[PDB]
Each structure stands twice: as structure tokens, then as C-alpha cells.
Amino acid sequence: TQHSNKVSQFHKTLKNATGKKLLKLQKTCLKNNKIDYIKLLGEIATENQFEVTYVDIEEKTFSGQFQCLVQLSTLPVGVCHGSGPTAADAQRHAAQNALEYLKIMTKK
């Protein structure tokens, strides 16, 4: 029952922030390709006192796309992921996944 309180605690601590870029991320349709996700997600990392880890998996897909998972060192922690044939596109996909994921926790 302590982890129900931990789920509620994580929901509250990621719905308690009042940053402008988080409000912009919730407002902006993140399916748009004009938004950088790597640089914006690094800015969000520097803003929200956690550290983004781009753990780049050495094992690619069976179809041949390089894989990389990101870690958002919050309390509790979060892990997102992405894939793509080059490192930049896969990291952009993983950052977009983590940014829409934060768009879930910034939804009120």
C-alpha cells in the first residue's frame, strides 16, 4: 500500500511544477515534426533537476533499426525508449516518446 502512495506521490510531484516549457509541451501537439525533442528534453532535464540518460542499446532491431532507451531520473524514476536506423533519428524518436510521456503526466 506504500506504492499506491508512491504512485500518488509521483503524480503530485509531476503535476506540482509550474514551468512555462511544461505548459508549452502540454499545449503543443507533439506529433509535429518542427519541434526538436532532444534539445527540448535536455532543457526539461536541466529545468526539472533530473538527468536524462541516453542508454544506447548495442542490440538493434531484427529489422535493422538502432535502439536507444532514455531514463528520466525523477522520484520515482521513468524510462522511455525509441528506435530508428541512425542514432540521431532513434534518439529523436526516444525523446519524442519521453516528451509525450511527460505530456501524460503534465495533463491535468
Binding site: 500500500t1 506504492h3 499506491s4 508512491k6 504512485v7 509521483f10 503524480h11 542508454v55 542499446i57 548495442e58 542490440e59 538493434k60 532491431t61 531484427f62 535502439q67 532507451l69 531514463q71 520515482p76 524514476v77 521513468g78 524510462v79 522511455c80 525508449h81 528506435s83 510521456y101 501524460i104 503526466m105 495533463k107
Partner: protein
């Protein structure tokens, strides 16, 4: 709130006993029990005819370990047992003749029969364990096919097959028909269905088996969003490549890389569970299951040290937080102001959940039982009903609870397993009293654990086994039973499943040995039960309890459930079916017999009546008639309990409370009188090394003066003894004077003044503050001084009395200086005199004997010291006095002893060194004050008129007049018993703990783990098909299933998306109706006696009757109705430690009053002795007195209420009453003897239980010198009725008075308490060959007789004593629980007076501990195991199988022996079995009466095998640290009840010590807190 008890584990055993039978059961414990006790029952016939009981299985021959079958058989089947090992050479010599039960393979028994050493005529019982396996079937195919049906049916041993519950098999039903038919054809037995399944099928109302279809799920935006993010997570997880050679890539971890687990398996299981819950139940249930999986996964993060597992589990927890966010936002999307979250669950729920809610709403007392196959579904379902009941006022009246199948492994996590088991017991407790009507179970609640009667069972999952389906069907036991199965295009599959399972019910329930009454037959019973009047023992009373035909079977069931029993003794009525053809009409007849625990052992015979249920109702009607005719059922028809039983009134008046009684009461809180001389002669002086004083030994016999006793009453002669002063051991004799002295008043006054001077100023044994008066009605004993005559005698020293009278105020006074100047010295004056000082202590002087005159010592001589040079200088410095004449020699003195008691019979001479030489507490102070050596000066000291030798004779009399005032009450008790009796004339340790734990854990292993393997094979196997072919009955399956299909679509099972003469004539179709009109007449009913008269006339008019046999009804009746079957179905020894040495009641002087006064002196005063030596045996007499008497007054009354009678008569309140009516209370001494305060020279508050502590001790007073028998007459003096009463008049026998005759009354009645009548044999003779059967039951008991050392004159009490409570075949006598009941008290005396009479002389605490260690059920169990009495006894109970199985696993791993209960000793004295303990005790009843009340015979027989271990307990006697802590504070240190703290996790235990305080200790559990409290008490006290 009650249930009708059915014959479970009774019809199975009866059908397994009568005909060749096949039993299919779930647990492997119950099948092995039924096989084991069937071997036990058939071994009675295997013993006489020289036959072999066999056990065929596949677990045999696997290892040299004793498998479960061998160890269970060598404990419980109290027989000779052998099991084949895989690699033995099979000795053919005597292993099949010297072993009752042999456990062989089918191949092993086949090859044994092939060698023709053992024949098929020489085997009695064949039992085939798990023969439904196809491998076992092919094993036993040649065994049957070549030997068994070629053998004649007269040469056939009885065949019982065991099978797994093959009904649960997932094959087609034509395969099941081929199974039943082929296995009946091969194994040659009827298949009796025989399980919990079929008793809950037959004997409970079969539910309407409902299918409820549910619609497929509709989706909304939240549902596709959740499914999309989880499908993305499965895309990543199945996309993720796992390889130990890629994550790590180390070649030196080749065996270690395999042990690293896959970090995707738990994500796959978790999100697959969430995916199927999204698919079938809904996003609400999925969010709850995701919350549960987060609660699991955050701990699963903590457990792992690997990195990739950690980031993947963090990713899964990330996904769970995502799902919680979407679902909580969507539920808060609809959570407006006043919006109903009930409807928010309603819209998002799947139609499966809403259809379950409709099933719940159709049930507006409820008992709902909902199953599932997964635990997390159970938890989320529980939370659905909780959130619904907290939001829906319609379902607000619903209380629900869930239970999971998560019994953890105890070898890894035992504490969490204990938590889950405690939680399980708690919720089963909260469910079984109907606090919460809705329970959600899992597969663990299908078998094993029972539930009460339910009215609705809902299966969420349609099961793959029939055992789960029909157990769910059976759990709805109440009459409105509804078996709802939910499904969500699967309607056709569920319809096929229902038709298949109802087909299994059809060919399983009808394939029985008992069957049901059909519904039209039930309606026939309804119209038939009104044809007879209600049997009433009180027909005049309108509101009397009545027995009709219909409720009679329920009353007989309740009477059979009401007999006293444990959890595993199970007693049921036994009715047997017989059809009789009469005038061409088939009229079934029902016989009925009660169990043996009820004394009605004879069969009760019904009459033939045309239907089954009416004949059963007549059997129950005549059974209730015979029940009230004997007296087991009262007028109110309630069967007799232990509390409600009342014995005969001549034994009930002792329980009446006293008027004072009716701390709680009764709880633990001039005449020539007799003259005698006291002659003292030294016989053993003090040794020279023991004489620390270094002085001359003074015997008392050199003294010219001694003492004499002058008594008005006659002094009886007593045994000689000695006195042990500082001088040594002195023999004491009481010399009788040859002449009688007259009395004079002035000499009486002088003698009384001498006594006052002796008791106040000489011996000081009459201390002050009290008064004295030398004229008492109670005795007139005087003590006189005498001087030895020159002729050799002793004459009264009247001159000494005159000197004492003239010197009554002798005190040390200041002698003047002129008188000391004029004082000379005489050595004869100071030869053997007593000196006191007058320079110091004038008010309280000290008295010293004269030891040595020293002419070399003088006042001019040197004082022993440098501060005082001379004695004169010492005196003039310390006291300022001048010694006048200093030329005289000094004086050596000897101090008096500081201890008054000197006898304590025959242990003071070695107790002189115990405490420092009479304990000398003033010696150290006076040697510090007066500088060690007490060399005195005779002119400055005074001389007493009392001589020093007479003083040494006078100090050995401590107890003088309080002794005489006390030792008349005991002689008065002696006079009363001699008046009413005839005898007597009227005028390391941690290593030990860890070894015990490892042996217990590794040796249990035949316990609930077998229940967990049953739980494993519950929903997994359902296997072992044999053969199926194209037979035409397959088409007989296909139509009927379709017919069953047309039931389900039409019976409401599938729910879519929406004249009294006429009944008397039919009552007796073979009886003419004009006779019935003659008997009826003005009346309106036919009585039972009318039916007896009609059947008696039919037997008279038609003398040839017939019988036929069917049913599950037992052949355990036999004899009374069967075996003969000749046309009757209408009506009925050294003298050491010798108990038996009763001395003669003619010519005996009777008891000495010293032993009675020992019974009157307690341990509270503790004046050398105590009552606890006698009462420790005395309490054990009362049972041995009362119970044996209660064996003879109520011979046909069972022990379950005689135990209540014994507990009422042996009770401490009862002995309080019995001691108070004799008014003994002023007779004990409960005050400390001390003359200042509580002695009157010529009261005591006494506790309740302490009065009892005298009274039982009183019979101990008559234990030895009176023997037992006249001791019985002492409770005839009490009124404890133990001996039979004969009422007579004055016989006038001048030879002697009758031993036990009382005083005559006003009607001159004379009561004689004669001998105990010898009991009748319990061998009832309803059959004319009960002696022949008793001879036919016990072949091998001569080995039992040579093992003990006793040969029985009669096997009647032995055969009863060898017979279980639930052993209904042994119908001749009762069970072994009536010879337990008196044998325990008889062996309790044998052990107790063995422990009391031995010359080691243990303490009262030591004797109590030796009793409580030497008497328990475990020690009789131990000597039962060790000396081979796992070889003779008979038994019939279910779980005794596994209990006593694991018991001899414990014993034989240890090697029988003792040490486990020798640890249980002080590990529990500071109950795994019962029966085999009391088995060894049960024979102690039989030899109590086979030897005709000879305790010496029993002890002599059992001594040769008891002697080394009672010697070992006589090596373990000398005291204990726990016994230390209980001799300091036995009652004072009391450990209080624990109290919970505010944290709710800690427990505090407070121990209170009186006059010291309360000490509290805290701890996590109760034992640690109690230990902390004990350590705090030890730290404050020690």
C-alpha cells in the same frame, strides 16, 4: 444454521467391506486411510485362516527409504508390516507368515504367486492403489487375466480398487463409458463413486446449472489509448534482444550465465495480464491490476542486483504509472459535481462484469461463492465489489472478501508463509460465521478446506476439469442452490461443456451403491408420511416433542452427531436395505443400527413397506422408539450431552453445596493417674573432630534426675527414637511406672508453679504477653521432676519442687562487696551447675553450663588481649567493678544451643553441621563484645537451682503443650474411624535446539506438503485414459447430449442477452382392508403397534419370509440380523512395594495419631514436615476410588458423561464441601508456632483448596497401616460413595463387629459396605457365538501376552481395550474409552505410590515434577512404540492415518526410543497423537479386572520393561533451574496478560511480584516480551 450429518468416510468403508468395490478419491491421504483400515478389518479374518493381507502400488520398490505406505502401516495398522525394497533378494522363509500386511508390486506379487509358495487361497484382501493409471492397468491385466477370474468365486480374496477422480478427465464421454465398463470387467468390482463429490451431489440439493452469456467488449478512447501504449510496450519488449553473451560476454561464467534470469519474462506476464484484463474485464479492473503490479514491481526492483533487469523493471513501472495516469484522468474526467462514479464504472465495465452484477442483483440469507483461476483477478474483483458497495445503495448490504492461493514455500520464506496462513485462518473464521456473505476463492478452496452451505456459486472461468465444476456445484448446499457460470459465440462451447458434465453426473451418481430417492418417490414419501401417527413418549402433552416418520431420520442423524468424539472420530447411523416380496408385491425393509459409542449395539428391525423412503422413515421411527425404550433419548428427544447428564441420586448428594458456601469460594485462595518416665541413654556420641568446643561429652544418663509425665488418659505405646543434641545420639524410651501416685492439692499447686517457672524462666518456651491458667478441660497432663532411686527405680523429687517453689523469683542481683569479701569457693557447688551474670544483662540473663575448673587461671593471670592485661583490669575498665577475692580459680563456661528442635526424626545428628552448631546467632555478637573466650569469675556470677545435666535433659523438649493441645484432635479422628470401621480399638543447548528443528522439519514431510501435491494434481492431471472404440453407445452419447442440450435451452439454464382408507390401502398392499378398518375404527391414524400386529399376523398366517441384500448399508450389523439369517426380520509378587498387602481389620490397633497430625500440619507453617507428602498421593486416590465405582454403577453408560461426574466428584469444591461437613477446620494448624502471639497454654484462617489439601491427604494417612480397603471405609466416613451399600439390622455376630458397619439409627438399621462386586463381562450375547467371534478376532495376542508378562484369563476387556471409539464392527462390547477411564487412575496410583514409597525421599516439588513427567499420554505412547505394541490394536479413523504415520517417521528416524518426549518434558511441562498413547494405558484397565483388582500383578508384569527408564527418571530427579525459580516465587511472580501498544506492532508483558512491584518488558512477540519481563524481574530480585 445446522446441517444433516451424512455418512462420509463410513459408506465408503462399508461398501469397501461388503462387496468387491472401487473407490475414487481426491486426497492420497484418504485413499491410503481407507485401504489401511480395510486391511485392519480384514486382518481379523486373515489371522485365523492363515492368510495374507496385501497392498499393491507403484511407490513401492523405488528407494531404500521407508515410503509413506510402510511407515503408516507399521504405526497405525497395529500388525506386523513388511515392505519390499528395490534390491532385496526376497527371503521366502517367513516374511508372508510373520507379517500381517505385505506391500508388494503387482509384478512382485505376480512372481510370488507364480512360485506357488503363497497361494490365492492364502490371501484375504487385495487392494490396488491407483489402478486407474493405464500403466497400472497394463500391469494388473495379466494378474487378473491369468489368475483371478480363472479362480472360483469361493477362492477369491476381496478386491478393493483405488483410483484418481477420473470424472475430471477432459476426454469425450464415450471414452468415460469405456473406462467404467472395461475397468469393471477387468478388476471385477462395482465402482462406488465414493468421494466428497458424491456426498455433496446426493445429500445436498443439486443446483440449477446456469449458463450466463456475456456480450463482447465495446471500446472507447481511453481503452484504445491504454491498449496502444501497452501494445507499444510489447512491441519494444518482444523487439528487445536478450543474450548473456551480449550483455556480459564473459567466457568464464559459462555455468553462471544460465542462472541469470531473463528480464523480459516478468514484463511479459505482467502486461499480458493487463492486456487480458483490458480484453475481458475493463479499464477499471486493468488500472487496479496495474496498481497491484506496481506494488509488486517496486519490491521486485529492490530484490535484483542486475542492471538490465533494473532498467527493464523501471520501464514496466513507468508503464504502470502511465496507465494509472490515463485511467485516473479518465475517471476524473467523468467525476463532476454530483456525478455518479458508480455509473463511471458501469460505462467502462465489460458486459461480463455487468452480467455478474445482474447475477448479484438477482439475489436481493445470502452466501455467494465466486471462483476464478488467477489471484490478481480475485483481488481486483474484490475491489470492484468493495467500491460498488461503498457507492451503490442497492448493493450496500453486501460484504465481500477474497482469498488467494499463495501458500509460500516454508524452506525459503517461513515467516511470510506463517502470515499468509494466519490471514487464511482469520478470513475463514470471518467467513464461516456468515459475517461476509460473498467470498472470492481460487483453486485452493475447491478441495481440502470446507465451507458452509451456500446458495449461489458463480464461476468466472469455465473450468477444464469436472472436479472443479462439480465441487463448485456442491458448495451451493442449501435448497435454493444456483450454479451460475459466466462466459463471454462461446455459448455453444459452454452448452457442450454443461451437457458433458451433466452426462458425467448421470453416469457417476447413478453408478453408486446408495443412490437417491427420486422426486416422484419424494412426493410418494410426502403422501405416505401422513399415514402414521407421531410417536410421542408423552402423547398427553399437546406441545410435546414429536417424532413422525419424516423427521425421525433427522433426529437419528442428530443423535449420532451428538455422541462425544474428537475431530477424527466420526459416528453415523447405519441403515441397510432389504427387499421382501409379499403377495407378489415388492416391499423394501430397512434395518437400522446406532454406533457402538451408544450402548444400543443391537440392530433395530423395520417392516417391509412398498417404497424406499417410507421404509427408511419406519426404520428411523422404530429406532427412535427403541431409543426412548432403553433411555438414550429423553422425553424432549434431545440426545444426552455431558453437562445435561444426571447420574443416580445416591451419588449426586455429594455435589450439593454447603450453606456457608452457597477470591471465589472453593478456589486456591486426687486421682491415681498414669505416670511415665522419659529415659534417655546415649548410644552414639559426637565425634572428636565434630566437637569444635573441645569439651567433655555430657550424656543425659549420668544425671541423677529426670522427667516424668502425669496423664489422666492412657498413653499408647509409640516407636522408639533418639534425640541428637551437641552431645550426640541418645536413645529415648518411655518407661512405664509400676505404681500409681495419688494427687494432693498443695503438691498440684507446687507442680503447676514449677511448670510456670520452667516454661517462663528456665526454658522460656511459654513466652509472655499471654496468660496462663493450670486447669483445662481438654487434658490434664503435668510434667514432674524425678530423681533415680537407689534401688534402680525413679521416685518423685518433691524436694526439687519445694526448692523451685521457694526460688520462683530467682534473678541475677548485685552481690555486695562485703559479701563477696566473705564469699568462699566450693568446686562441688561449681561442678555441674548453671551460671548467669549479674554485672551485665540483669533483666534478660544468659545461662551457661560449667565445663572446666582451671587452677592455673586466675584474676592475676593474663587476659587474652593486649588492651586488657589481666581479667581484673578488664573488669574494672569495662565495668568499673572491683573483685574482692582474687586467689580463686577461674571458670570455663559453655553456651547454650540457639536451636530448640532436636528430633526431626532421625536426621538431626547429620544436620548438626547444617547451620553453624545450632546456628549460634548470638555467639558472634557475644564473642565480639566479650572477646571470644568466655572465661568467667564465679564470685561475680550467680548459680541457678537447675542442674546443668538436668538442663541438658530439659532442652530437648521444644514442642510440649502446643504438642499436647494438637495431638488430641488426631486421636479423636482415630476414634471416629475406629468407631465406624472396626479396625483400631476405641479405648550445546543451541545445538540441541537446531538439531531438534532440523530433525522435525526433515522428518515431518508427510503432512500438508502431501496436501499441496494434491493441490498440484487438482487442476493439472485428469489423465490416464485406457481405450476407446467404435461401439454403438457412442451414438447413444450424441443424441443424449443433444437431449441434454434441449434441457439447457429450455430449462432456464441458458440465459440470452435479455379418503384416509385409500392411503392405508396403498400403505399395505398385501394386507386386507377390512382388518385395517377394524384397527382404525373411531380413530384417524394407524399406530406403530398396529403395524407390528399386522406384520406379526402376516408372519403367523404366512410363515415363509425372504430377504435380499443391496445398498451401501453395512454388513457391520451382522449376527443380530445376519450371519445366521434363520428367518427373523420382525424383532429381537513381592511384599516390597506391595499394594495388595491389606492388614487385618480384626485385632489391629489402628493408625498412630502422628501421621494424622502430619496430615493436620501444612507446608505454610513448615515445622519440619508438611501435608504435601500425603496429599500428592491422596488426590490420586479419589479418582481411583470414584471412577472404579463409576465403572460398576453405570456399566451401560458411556464414558463421556462419567468424565463429567468424575470431574464433579474429584473437584476441589467437592472436597471443600466433603471436608467441611466433617468440620475439620479447627483441626489443621495454619499458623506459625511461636509462643508470644498465637499459642494459648492449657485461631487459624485456612484457604479453601488447602482444606482439600488436608482431606485427600487424610486417606494418605490410612494408606500404609490400614491398607487400601479400610481406607475406602474412611470415605464411607466421609460420605464419598465408593463402596456398595447393603441395608440390614442388628445381626448380633459375637465373633467380631463387621468391618465397615456403622452406628445404628433410631430404626436400628445397620449398613454394611461389603466387597466390590466383580464386574460382568462386557461380552454381550445378542448373537449365540460372541465367544466364538471373540476367539476369532485376536490371533497373535499370545505374542502380546508374552511381551507384557501377563496372560489373560479373559479376552473380553482386552478386546474392548484394543478397539477404537469409531470401531463399529466389534459389536460385542463397547470401545476402549471406558477402560481408558479407570485404567489411567489405576496406573496413576501404580506410578504414584512407586514414586512415594521409595527410600530416596523426594521433595514435594520433586514428587510433583516426577509425577507430571512420569505421567502424560506421551510416555505411554513412547512405551507403546518401543516395546512393539504397534502390533495388536484395532482402529477406524480418517486422519489418524497421516498423524500416526508421521509419528513413527519421527520415532524410527530416532530409532523408536525416548528422547523427543524427554525433551518435550521441560519444553512443555514448564499432543501430536492420542490413541496409541491410551492404547498402552487401555490394557491397564483390562489387567485391572482380568487380574480381579490386583495392582501388584499389573506392577509386577510391567516392571521388567519399565525399570530402566524409571531408573533414568530417578537419575533426572535432582532439581532444576526452572524448579529453582519456582521454589523462590511459585505464586508470588505472576506473568500478566499482554497488552497492545499505540504503534500496534509491539507487545508488552508485565509480571507482578507481591511486595516487590510490577516489571514490564516489551518485544515484537509475546514470548520475547515475557522473557524480557522475566529478566527484568530477575534483575530487580536476584
Amino acid at each position: 444454521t445446522v446441517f444433516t450429518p451424512r455418512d462420509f468416510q463410513v459408506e465408503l468403508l462399508a461398501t469397501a467391506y461388503e462387496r468387491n468395490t472401487i473407490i475414487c478419491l481426491g486426497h492420497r491421504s484418504s485413499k491410503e486411510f481407507i485401504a489401511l483400515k480395510l486391511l485392519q478389518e480384514l486382518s481379523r479374518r486373515a489371522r485365523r485362516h492363515g492368510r495374507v493381507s496385501v497392498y499393491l502400488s507403484c511407490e513401492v520398490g523405488t528407494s531404500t527409504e521407508p515410503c509413506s505406505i510402510y511407515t503408516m502401516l507399521t504405526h497405525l495398522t497395529d500388525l506386523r508390516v513388511w515392505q519390499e525394497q528395490p534390491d532385496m533378494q526376497i527371503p521366502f522363509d517367513h516374511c508372508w507368515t510373520d507379517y500381517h500386511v505385505s506391500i508388494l508390486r503387482p509384478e512382485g506379487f505376480l512372481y510370488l504367486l507364480e512360485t506357488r509358495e503363497l497361494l490365492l487361497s492364502r490371501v484375504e484382501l487385495i487392494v490396488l492403489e491407483d489402478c486407474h493409471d493405464s500403466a497400472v492397468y497394463q500391469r494388473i491385466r495379466p494378474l487378473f487375466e491369468n489368475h483371478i477370474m480363472p479362480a472360483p468365486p469361493a477362492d477369491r480374496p476381496r478386491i478393493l480398487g483405488l483410483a484418481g477422480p477420473l470424472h475430471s478427465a477432459g476426454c469425450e464421454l464415450q471414452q468415460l463409458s469405456a473406462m467404467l465398463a472395461t475397468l469393471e470387467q477387468s478388476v471385477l468390482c462395482q465402482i462406488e463413486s465414493a468421494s466428497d463429490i458424491v456426498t455433496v451431489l446426493r445429500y445436498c440439493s443439486r443446483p440449477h446449472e446456469y449458463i450466463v452469456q456475456c456480450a463482447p467488449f465495446e471500446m472507447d478512447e481511453l481503452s484504445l489509448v491504454l491498449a496502444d501504449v501497452l501494445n507499444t510496450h510489447k512491441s519494444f519488449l518482444l523487439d528487445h534482444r536478450y543474450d548473456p553473451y551480449e550483455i556480459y560476454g564473459t567466457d568464464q561464467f559459462m555455468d553462471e550465465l544460465k542462472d541469470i534470469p531473463d528480464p523480459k519474462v516478468d514484463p511479459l506476464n505482467v502486461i499480458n495480464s493487463l492486456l487480458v484484463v483490458l480484453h475481458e474485464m475493463g479499464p477499471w479492473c486493468t488500472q487496479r491490476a496495474a496498481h497491484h503490479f506496481y506494488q509488486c514491481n517496486e519490491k521486485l526492483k529492490v530484490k535484483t542486483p542486475h542492471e538490465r533487469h533494473y532498467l527493464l523493471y523501471c520501464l514496466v513501472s513507468t508503464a504502470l504509472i502511465q496507465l494509472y495516469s490515463l485511467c485516473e484522468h479518465a475517471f476524473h474526467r467523468h467525476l463532476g459535481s454530483g456525478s455518479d462514479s458508480r455509473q463511471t464504472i458501469e460505462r467502462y465495465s465489460s458486459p461480463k462484469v455487468r452480467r455478474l452484477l445482474q447475477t448479484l442483483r438477482c439475489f436481493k440469507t445470502l452466501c455467494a461463492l465466486i471462483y476464478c483461476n488467477q489471484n490478481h483477478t480475485a483481488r481486483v474483483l474484490f475491489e470492484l465489489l468493495a467500491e460498488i458497495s461503498r457507492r451503490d445503495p442497492d448493493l450496500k448490504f453486501l460484504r465481500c472478501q477474497y482469498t488467494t492461493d499463495r501458500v509460500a514455500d516454508p524452506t525459503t520464506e517461513p515467516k511470510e508463509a506463517e502470515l499468509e496462513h494466519r490471514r487464511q485462518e482469520e478470513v475463514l473464521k470471518r467467513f464461516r460465521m456468515h459475517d461476509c456473505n460473498v467470498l472470492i476463492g481460487t483453486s485452493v478452496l475447491e478441495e481440502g478446506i470446507d465451507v458452509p452451505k451456500c446458495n449461489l456459486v458463480v464461476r468466472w472461468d469455465p473450468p477444464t476439469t469436472y472436479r472443479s465444476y462439480v465441487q463448485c456445484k456442491g458448495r451451493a448446499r442449501a435448497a435454493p442452490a444456483y450454479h451460475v457460470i459466466l462466459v463471454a459465440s462461446t455459448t455453444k462451447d459452454l452448452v457442450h461443456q454443461m451437457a458433458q458434465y451433466r452426462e458425467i453426473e448421470q453416469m457417476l451418481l447413478s453408478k453408486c451403491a446408495n443412490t437417491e430417492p427420486p422426486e416422484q418417490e419424494q412426493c410418494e414419501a410426502e403422501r405416505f408420511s401422513a399415514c402414521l401417527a407421531a410417536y410421542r413418549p408423552k402423547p398427553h402433552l399437546l406441545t410435546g416433542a414429536s417424532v413422525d416418520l419424516g423427521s425421525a431420520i433427522a433426529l437419528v442423524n442428530k443423535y449420532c452427531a451428538r455422541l462425544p468424539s474428537d475431530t477424527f472420530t466420526k459416528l453415523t447411523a447405519l441403515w441397510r436395505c432389504t427387499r421382501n416380496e409379499r403377495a407378489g408385491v415388492t416391499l423394501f425393509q430397512y434395518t437400522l443400527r446406532l454406533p457402538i459409542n451408544s450402548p444400543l449395539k443391537h440392530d433395530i428391525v423395520g417392516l417391509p413397506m412398498p417404497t424406499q423412503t417410507l421404509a427408511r422413515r419406519l426404520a428411523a421411527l422404530q429406532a427412535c422408539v427403541e431409543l426412548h425404550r432403553i433411555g438414550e433419548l429423553d422425553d424432549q428427544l434431545q440426545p444426552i450431552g455431558k453437562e445435561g447428564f444426571r447420574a443416580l441420586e445416591p451419588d449426586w448428594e455429594c455435589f450439593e453445596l454447603e450453606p456457608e458456601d452457597e477470591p471465589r469460594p472453593g478456589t486456591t485462595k486426687g486421682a491415681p493417674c498414669y505416670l511415665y518416665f522419659i529415659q534417655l541413654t546415649l548410644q552414639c556420641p559426637i565425634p572428636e573432630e565434630q566437637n569444635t568446643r573441645g569439651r567433655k561429652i555430657y550424656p543425659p544418663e549420668d544425671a541423677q534426675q529426670g522427667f516424668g509425665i502425669l496423664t489422666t488418659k492412657r498413653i499408647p505405646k509409640l516407636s522408639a527414637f533418639s534425640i541428637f543434641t551437641r552431645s550426640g545420639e541418645v536413645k529415648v524410651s518411655l518407661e512405664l511406672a509400676k505404681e500409681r501416685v495419688i494427687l494432693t492439692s498443695e503438691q498440684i499447686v507446687c507442680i503447676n508453679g514449677f511448670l510456670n517457672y520452667t516454661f517462663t524462666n528456665v526454658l522460656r518456651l511459654q513466652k509472655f504477653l499471654m496468660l496462663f491458667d493450670p486447669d483445662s478441660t481438654e487434658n490434664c497432663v503435668f510434667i514432674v521432676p524425678t530423681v533415680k532411686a537407689p534401688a534402680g527405680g525413679k521416685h518423685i523429687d518433691w524436694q526439687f519442687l519445694e526448692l523451685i517453689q521457694a526460688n520462683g523469683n530467682t534473678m541475677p542481683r548485685a552481690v555486695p562487696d562485703e559479701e563477696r569479701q566473705a564469699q568462699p569457693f566450693d568446686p562441688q557447688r561449681f561442678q555441674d551447675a548453671v551460671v548467669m551474670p549479674w554485672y551485665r544483662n540483669q533483666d534478660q540473663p544468659q545461662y551457661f553450663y560449667v565445663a572446666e575448673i582451671c587452677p592455673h587461671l586466675s584474676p592475676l593471670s593474663c587476659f587474652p588481649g593486649d588492651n586488657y592485661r589481666t581479667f581484673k583490669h578488664y573488669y574494672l575498665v569495662k565495668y568499673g567493678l572491683t573483685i574482692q577475692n582474687t586467689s580463686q580459680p577461674l571458670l570455663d563456661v559453655d553456651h547454650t544451643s540457639a536451636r530448640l528442635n532436636f528430633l526431626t526424626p532421625r536426621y538431626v545428628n547429620r544436620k548438626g553441621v547444617a547451620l553453624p552448631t545450632s546456628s549460634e546467632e548470638t555467639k558472634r555478637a557475644k564473642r565480639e563484645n566479650l572477646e571470644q573466650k568466655q572465661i568467667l569469675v564465679p564470685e561475680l556470677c550467680t548459680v541457678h537451682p537447675f542442674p546443668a545435666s538436668l538442663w541438658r535433659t530439659a532442652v530437648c523438649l521444644p514442642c510440649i503443650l502446643y504438642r499436647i493441645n494438637g495431638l488430641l484432635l488426631a486421636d479423636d479422628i482415630r476414634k471416629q474411624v475406629s468407631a465406624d470401621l472396626g479396625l483400631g480399638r476405641q479405648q550445546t543447548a543451541q545445538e540441541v535446539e537446531k538439531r531438534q528443528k532440523q530433525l522435525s522439519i526433515i522428518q515431518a514431510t508427510n503432512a500438508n506438503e502431501r496436501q499441496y501435491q494434491q493441490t498440484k494434481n487438482l487442476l493439472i492431471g485428469f489423465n490416464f485414459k485406457h481405450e476407446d472404440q467404435k461401439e454403438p453407445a457412442t451414438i447413444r452419447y450424441e443424441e443424449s447430449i443433444a437431449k441434454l442440450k434441449t434441457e439447457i435451452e429450455s430449462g432456464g439454464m441458458l440465459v440470452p442477452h435479455d379418503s384416509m382408507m385409500e392411503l392405508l390401502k396403498q400403505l399395505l398392499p398385501y394386507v386386507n382392508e377390512d382388518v385395517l378398518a377394524k384397527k382404525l375404527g373411531d380413530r384417524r391414524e394407524l399406530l406403530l403397534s398396529d403395524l407390528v400386529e399386522l406384520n406379526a399376523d402376516w408372519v403367523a398366517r404366512h410363515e415363509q419370509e425372504t430377504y435380499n441384500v443391496m445398498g451401501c448399508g453395512d454388513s457391520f450389523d451382522n449376527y443380530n440380523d445376519h450371519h445366521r439369517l434363520n428367518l427373523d426380520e420382525k424383532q429381537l509378587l513381592p511384599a516390597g512395594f506391595s499394594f495388595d498387602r491389606q492388614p487385618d481389620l480384626v485385632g489391629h490397633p489402628g493408625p498412630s495419631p502422628s501421621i494424622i497430625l502430619q496430615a493436620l500440619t501444612m507446608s505454610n507453617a513448615n515445622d519440619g514436615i508438611n501435608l504435601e507428602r500425603l496429599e500428592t498421593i491422596g488426590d490420586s486416590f479419589l479418582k481411583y476410588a470414584i471412577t472404579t465405582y463409576l465403572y460398576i454403577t453405570y456399566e451401560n453408560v458411556h464414558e463421556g458423561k462419567l468424565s463429567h461426574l468424575r470431574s464433579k466428584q474429584v473437584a476441589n469444591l467437592n472436597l471443600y464441601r466433603l471436608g467441611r461437613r466433617k468440620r475439620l477446620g479447627e483441626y489443621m494448624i495454619a499458623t506459625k508456632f511461636e509462643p508470644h502471639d498465637n499459642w494459648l497454654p492449657p485461631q487459624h484462617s485456612i484457604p479453601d483448596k488447602s482444606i482439600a489439601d488436608c482431606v485427600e491427604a487424610l486417606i494418605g494417612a490410612y494408606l500404609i497401616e490400614c491398607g487400601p480397603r479400610g481406607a475406602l471405609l474412611f470415605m464411607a466416613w466421609l460420605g464419598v460413595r465408593v463402596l456398595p451399600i447393603t441395608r440390614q439390622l442388628d445381626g448380633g455376630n459375637q465373633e467380631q463387629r463387621i468391618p465397615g458397619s456403622t452406628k445404628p439409627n433410631a430404626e436400628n438399621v445397620v449398613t454394611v459396605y461389603g466387597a466390590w462386586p466383580t464386574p460382568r463381562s462386557p461380552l454381550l450375547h445378542f448373537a449365540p457365538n460372541a465367544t466364538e467371534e471373540l476367539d476369532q478376532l485376536l490371533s497373535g495376542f499370545e505374542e502380546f501376552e508374552e511381551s507384557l508378562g501377563y496372560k489373560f484369563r479373559d479376552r473380553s476387556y482386552l478386546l474392548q481395550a484394543m478397539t477404537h471409539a469409531s470401531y463399529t464392527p466389534n459389536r460385542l462390547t463397547d470401545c476402549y474409552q471406558r477402560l481408558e477411564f479407570l485404567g489411567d487412575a489405576v496406573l496413576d496410583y501404580l506410578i504414584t505410590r512407586h514414586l512415594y514409597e521409595d527410600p530416596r525421599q523426594h521433595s514435594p516439588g520433586a514428587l510433583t515434577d516426577l509425577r507430571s513427567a512420569l505421567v502424560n499420554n506421551t510416555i505411554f505412547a513412547s512405551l507403546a512404540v518401543r516395546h512393539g505394541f504397534h502390533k495388536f490394536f484395532r482402529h477406524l479413523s480418517p486422519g489418524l492415518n497421516d498423524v500416526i504415520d508421521r509419528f513413527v517417521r519421527i520415532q524410527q528416524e530416532n530409532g523408536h526410543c525416548i528422547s523427543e518426549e524427554y525433551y518435550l518434558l521441560s519444553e512443555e511441562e514448564c499432543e501430536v497423537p492420542k490413541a496409541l498413547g491410551d492404547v498402552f494405558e487401555s490394557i491397564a484397565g483390562a489387567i485391572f479386572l482380568d487380574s480381579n483388582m490386583s495392582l501388584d500383578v499389573v506392577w509386577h508384569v510391567y516392571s521388567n520393561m519399565m525399570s530402566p527408564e524409571i531408573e533414568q527418571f530417578s537419575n533426572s530427579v535432582p532439581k532444576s533451574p526452572i524448579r529453582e525459580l519456582l521454589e523462590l516465587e511459585p505464586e508470588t511472580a505472576k506473568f500478566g496478560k499482554p497488552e497492545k501498544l499505540a504503534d500496534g506492532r509491539r507487545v508488552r508483558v508485565t509480571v507482578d511480584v507481591f511486595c516487590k512491584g510490577t516489571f514490564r518488558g516489551i518485544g515484537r512477540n509475546y514470548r520475547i516480551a515475557k522473557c524480557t519481563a522475566a529478566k527484568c524481574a530477575l534483575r530487580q530480585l536476584k
